[PDB]
Design goal:
Four copies of one chain form a homotetramer.
Chain A lengths: L3 H11 L3 E5 L3 H9 L5 E3 L1 H8 L10 H14 L4 E4 L8 H14 L3 E5 L18 H13 L7 E6 L2 H4 L1 H13 L4 E4 L5 H11 L4 E3 L11 H6 L4 E4 L2 H20 L12 H7 L3 H10 L2
Parallel strand pairs in A: 1-2, 1-8, 2-3, 3-4, 4-5, 5-6, 7-8
The complex binds magnesium ion (4 copies).
């Protein structure tokens, strides 16, 4: 039997600074695979904004995410790392079901963060985080729920923005000691900080190189020098895809024809090639006739 | 109670040549609405190639389509026309369940075509179509299943490529006579053909202006002169979005950073604006405090 | 367009003490309809223990419940009251999505309660309830989210066991004042208490006559004398069904045949009659031939 | 990694006449497990009549079945054999997706039959079957799609009723030679017939001991003597559960109280025990405190 988790860990071994790109849907997972990537990502913010057209305010449910996990892993063999936010539910039972369901859906790993989420019905969108102790319990529940020993439980901390660097590092160490297998320090502002986390936990470090945020657009070489194990680009393709779609919609609405934007489109031939369209009639010939 | 079907019919009245753009996901449905469109489309080929990463060979299930219908209509109020292929089943019972399920999922209408399908396990893809009599039953079952009288049952015919113009028109009349409320003559090659269909059925006619196909890129004005009621652009934005995504994946892989393609990305402000991000905290302020 | 919520409200009018029976699945919803009932219920504890085989500890997700709502209402026309627990999320945004999703799924109404929930990962099950103020917001968000004005928002309070009668009544009035359309005072022990709630809120009151609990098995006549508007039997059939199933499994295991328990089984004719089997070929004859 | 298929094959080795009982939902799977069964079953007729309240006329979709597969296998470790009817779709691609999806959903095996299904929109419910050649292709597609070598592909033939015994046996041999791993001869009328199939295919034979059909209620001893490998009781518990539920609904409607039927109900304590209610707080104590 195949273990996507094993595949993720193997990818980390063969690619210093393992590049992991977010894939908004199954089609883009195939594009990323054809582009040469060894691992892909399912952004929680992407499931919300892309699949549901909703803001990343914790409105998405576990099932909205599972559906996307199944769609991508049903057709793409690359190991998929999944954004599990805070475990979809406050109970250890909720965290456990999330872990087991994502593994069953085909995911190679997931990251769970220390954010609080909504504490009250009228609680405004926020970046507040739970105590170190609460997150350790969250992590313990997630690790204990692993049905595939090679599935990866990555812990993410958003403590930098609300507690500063030293506190974030201290939390990170407690998270790893609790069982976290990899560390994801969110919104790091300086390259040297990644190195500090690396020397502090002794486990693979992921750097979220998303755009328009607090983190600079560090190159793979810069991240390698800082001992970063993974380079994540969570919504990069999604952002470009949206601009391109918007432009088509506008031109079509403005001019009553798409003539002016044909040159910006993936061709029919390219689409077929991307979805291994020909591997289908080939299988038919191999099985019959 | 709101009826998307009623809204779709209304849209036809306030827009000669009603533009209908395919929306691959909920996010794009919101982009189309922000672009001023009054009706959107869920491409069957888009669900397959985009949501599932599979070719358009009838591998998609009713449920794959239902999921996209709900995701889109749960957040976008524009009426959604859905590609229902042949009804997802060979029995009148399947056609009925498909119709009722799509209505409940939130669709404003759907089109069912006269293609035969697979039939045999090792059957090769084709353009073969069922008998006029067979399609008539297919339509009768679909119309009978409507739980919302305003939901639209559109009949699509692929008879041109396999039976010729005169044959396709004969079928059309029979289809409409059977209850088809709108007509979708596929792969028309000449503008004058549309006019012929229009004069023959007396029901709104849809023109599928998809690229890289057999149909010229007719403008809305040209279509209006041919008495076309709807201009459909099924995968236009999808094609541009894939090309843009692919570009990001390649540049990122080749240069170790996305710096070079930032200018091709939708900004954070644009993303937030497009998903009505601000309306969320505004609702919290209106409800509480 | 049909409104289940409107139908539910109508049912209350044609049945003093409106009997509402829990239906574990679609098949049982049809049995209840054939038994003459005018309203049915989807127990949250039933979804957990029956559909998921899990205890009622908040492990079930909104989607587990939505699936059962669709299955039941796609085939049974009776108005379905749904147990929505605390809204499946702590934010007003979750409450809103739950409401809108359940309406679209086909429900006629739902009840949300004032229980706190887990809050912490290692938190133990309890009967703790949020503040009166907190529940009020929960209700305001739910009512504001209604897409069908006739959909029912019922408020349930578990304040008796933890705060006493006088406290529970105070909350009730505040809840109704906040928009709660009907009231569900949980685990009432005395018939006279129901009358007190009824006289205090001026909205329909529901009595949860579930077995093996703190509430006596009050008859419909007794409840009518206490001004109870609805008599709920949440898992009654489920409990009998499990005992009967267990019997078959044991006898079959012990005797190597089911011969001995055939007389405890619904016959083939009864099954067909209950799922309107015959209506199917009758539709084929009416539509075709 | 665990393989339910391996578990099914192992169960066959340790239990001559392996008893396999149908479990309508997750809860009943746990009851069957506590009753001592080593393997369980997901009836397609049960998914239709029980989960959807629909007749077994091919209206159910693959996803309706997958949902039930996930629900049962998420909580019960017993290997689950699944009714896959004819593969949900006429294409080899449809059969393949069905196989891969069911394996991913957690199933241990499935049986696919040689029925035709609906060949026309107005095709009445029928028992017609495809040619031997067509079924062989169906089987080849299913076996080739196996992602877990231990997953079981069982072929079922309904040829007895429309072609007689000799033809059914001939088909069976062709089905096994095509790759079928186990054989399911539907509606066998005589014990000696099972022995004939057994000697003819050299692979495990399953006897569908459902009630109210053409097959006598053969005991495990009788089946053992006929060399039957598995004894299936597809809807036995379901039938009893329905009668029990119906009775509760009737008494409640007739008498306005469930007092008279309390003795027919599984108690609250028994319900908790069945769903290992206590294993939950035990896990909390083991993980925390
Ligand atoms: Mg997030
Ligand atoms: Mg199509
Ligand atoms: Mg509850
Ligand atoms: Mg069947």
């Amino acid at each position: 039997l195949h273990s996507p988790g094993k595949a993720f860990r193997a990818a980390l071994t063969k690619e210093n600074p393992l590049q992991i790109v977010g894939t908004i849907n199954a089609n883009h997972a195939l594009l990323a695979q054809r582009a040469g990537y060894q691992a892909i990502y399912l952004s929680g913010g992407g499931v919300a904004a892309g699949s549901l057209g909703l803001p990343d305010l914790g409105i998405s449910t576990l099932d909205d995410v599972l559906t996307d996990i199944r769609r991508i892993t049903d057709v793409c063999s690359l190991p998929l790392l999944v954004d599990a936010d805070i475990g979809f539910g406050s109970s250890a039972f909720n965290v456990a079901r999330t872990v087991k369901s994502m593994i069953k859906a085909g995911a190679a790993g997931l990251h769970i963060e220390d954010q609080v989420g909504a504490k009250r019905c009228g609680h405004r969108p926020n970046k507040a985080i739970v105590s170190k102790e609460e997150m350790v319990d969250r992590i313990r529940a997630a690790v204990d729920a692993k049905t595939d020993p090679d599935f990866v439980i990555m812990a993410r901390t958003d403590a930098l923005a609300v507690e500063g660097l030293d506190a974030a590092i201290e939390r990170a160490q407690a998270y790893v000691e609790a069982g976290a297998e990899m560390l994801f320090p969110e919104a790091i502002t300086e390259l040297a900080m990644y190195r500090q986390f690396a020397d502090a936990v002794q486990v693979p470090i992921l750097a979220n190189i998303t755009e328009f945020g607090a983190t600079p657009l560090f190159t793979t070489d810069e991240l390698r020098s800082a001992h970063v194990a993974m380079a994540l680009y969570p919504l990069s393709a999604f952002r470009a895809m949206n601009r391109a779609a918007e432009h088509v919609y506008n031109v079509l609405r403005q001019e009553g024809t798409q003539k002016s934007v044909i040159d910006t489109m993936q061709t029919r031939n390219e689409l077929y090639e991307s979805i291994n369209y020909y591997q289908y009639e080939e299988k038919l010939d191999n099985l019959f006739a």
